[PDB]
Design a binder for this molecule. Structure first.
Ligand SMILES: NC(=O)c1ccc(NCc2cccc(O)c2)nc1
Ligand SMILES: NC(=O)c1ccc(NCc2cccc(O)c2)nc1
Lengths: 242, 242
C-alpha cells in the first residue's frame, strides 16, 4: 500500500534484526509493509583485512569511517533504490527528531539511512552524498545504528496496516489503568468505571493537559488550544491551586 | 571496575542482542564491564496462552501491559539487583534525555529498565515500582526496547575501559576529514595538513562554535563561553557576515 522501503548502510547489519524480527515492526516486514535492506561497507573493501576505518587529517585520538568502502556502499544502495530516495545521515549534529519530523520523514516512500561509527564520516561525503542530517536527541552513542532503528520504528507506525496519539494533538498522554481495581491500596478513578464515554473522554483530555502543563509546560506554549482544551486546562490549574 | 549492571524487563529480550553481541557495547559485555540481564513478563504468566496484555478501564482502542506478570518480573529483577538499583521507565511522558542526563544516569552502578509495549503500563505501577521516568526524545515508538538500548549505549560510553567529546563542552562537533586529499573536487582544509597542533585545535574549536551557532543557537545561550571561545565565535560570525 503505502509500502516503505528503507536502505541501510551499516557495519553491523545484524543489529537491525531487533526491528525486522520482532514485534509490530517485525510483522510489518513479514507482511511486506516495510522493507529494510542493508549494505555493509565491509563488503566493499578490497584489502586483505577488510579495513573500514581511517585516520583523520589533522590528528586526534579518534578514527573516521574510511571513505571508499562507505561511498561505494552508499552508491550501491542508491542504485537499488532507484529514483526519489532521500539519503539521511544520523548524527548528533543533525536536525533534532520530534514527532512532527517523523511525520515529515514518513511521507517518503524510500529512505536510505547511513549509520556512522567511530567519529563519523568525512564532511565531504555529507556534502556530496547526504540529503538530510538528523539527530534522535542530544546525546552521543557508539554508532548510528540505534538512531536509524529508532527512526525506522517511529516512521513505520505511520504506514497504513502496521498498527492494529494524544501526542498527535501535541500533549503528553493521560494515565491509564487496567486490572485489578485496587493495586497496593491505589484505586482506579471512578469515572473510568462509569461507562460514561463523554465524561471519560473529557477526564482523559484534562489529565493530558494537566500532565503536559506540569511536566513539559513549553510544549503547551507551542499549541493553539481548542476552546474545550482551554477550559479543562483552566480547571486542572485551579484544582492544582486548590 | 566501574562495572555497570543493567536489568531489563522486556517482552522481547532478544532485541537486546543488538547491543550485547556487537560493536563497542558487545565488547563491554564480553569483558564484563557491562552486564545486561533480561526478564520477560511472559515467563511470569500462569494462563495457558501466556497473556501479557490487558484492557484499559474506561475503554479505548489500545491495550496495556498486564499488571501481574509485569509486576512479578520487576520484583524478580529488583531481588537480583540487591540494594541501590534505580528503576527507570522509558516513555514519551518522561524526563527528556540529553547528555547531561546520561552523565547523571551513568553514576548508577545498577539500573533496572522497564520496557513498555502497547499503550504502556498501569499508572499505579509507575507510582509503586518506578523511581524515574525518562524519554529519549519527543516521538512515539512501538515499544520501550529501543529507548532502553539507546540509554544503555549512551551510559556505557562513560564506563572506564569501554571506549578505546566536543559535546562534553556543550558544542556540536567540528567537520572531520580523512583520505583522499581531494574528493569530488573538494579539498581538505590546508590547516589540517599543516601539522600545527595549536592552529588545528583552534580551527576545530572555531568550527564547532560556528556550527553550533548556525544549527543550534539555543545550545549556545546555555553556555558560559571561555575567553578563547568568545573570541573564535566572534571571528566566525564576522567571517559569516563577510
Ligand atoms: N544523537 C544521534 O542521533 C546520534 C547519532 C549517531 C551517534 N553516533 C555515531 C556517530 C555519528 C556521527 C558522528 C559521531 O561522533 C558519532 N550517536 C548519536
Ligand atoms: N520517546 C520514548 O522514550 C519512548 C518510550 C517508549 C515508547 N513506546 C512504548 C510506550 C511506553 C509508554 C507509553 C506508550 O504510549 C508507549 N516510545 C517512545
Amino acid at each position: 500500500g503505502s509500502h516503505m522501503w528503507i536502505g541501510v548502510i551499516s557495519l553491523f547489519p545484524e543489529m537491525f534484526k531487533a526491528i525486522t524480527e520482532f514485534g509490530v515492526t517485525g510483522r510489518a516486514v513479514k507482511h511486506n509493509l516495510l522493507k529494510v535492506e542493508c549494505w555493509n561497507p565491509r563488503d566493499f573493501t578490497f584489502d586483505k583485512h577488510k579495513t573500514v576505518d581511517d585516520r583523520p587529517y589533522g590528528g586526534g585520538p579518534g578514527m573516521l569511517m574510511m571513505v571508499q568502502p562507505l561511498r561505494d556502499a552508499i552508491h550501491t544502495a542508491k542504485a537499488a533504490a532507484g529514483e526519489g530516495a532521500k539519503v539521511i545521515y544520523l548524527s548528533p549534529q543533525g536536525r533534532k527528531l520530534d514527532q512532527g519530523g517523523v511525520t515529515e520523514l514518513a511521507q517518503n516512500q524510500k529512505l536510505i539511512l547511513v549509520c556512522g561509527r567511530y567519529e563519523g564520516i568525512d564532511e565531504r561525503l555529507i556534502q556530496t552524498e547526504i540529503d538530510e542530517e538528523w539527530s534522535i536527541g542530544d546525546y552521543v552513542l557508539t554508532g548510528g545504528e540505534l538512531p536509524a532503528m529508532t527512526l525506522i520504528d517511529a516512521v513505520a507506525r505511520f504506514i497504513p496496516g502496521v498498527l492494529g496519539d494524544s501526542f498527535a494533538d501535541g500533549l503528553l498522554d493521560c494515565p491509564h489503568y487496567t486490572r485489578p481495581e485496587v493495586l497496593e491500596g491505589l484505586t482506579v478513578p471512578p469515572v473510568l468505571m462509569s461507562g460514561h464515554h463523554e465524561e471519560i473522554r473529557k477526564w482523559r483530555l484534562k489529565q493530558s493537559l494537566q500532565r503536559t502543563w506540569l511536566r513539559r509546560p513549553e510544549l503547551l506554549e507551542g499549541l493553539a488550544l481548542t476552546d474545550e482544551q482551554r477550559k479543562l486546562l483552566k480547571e486542572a490549574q485551579a484544582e492544582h491551586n486548590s
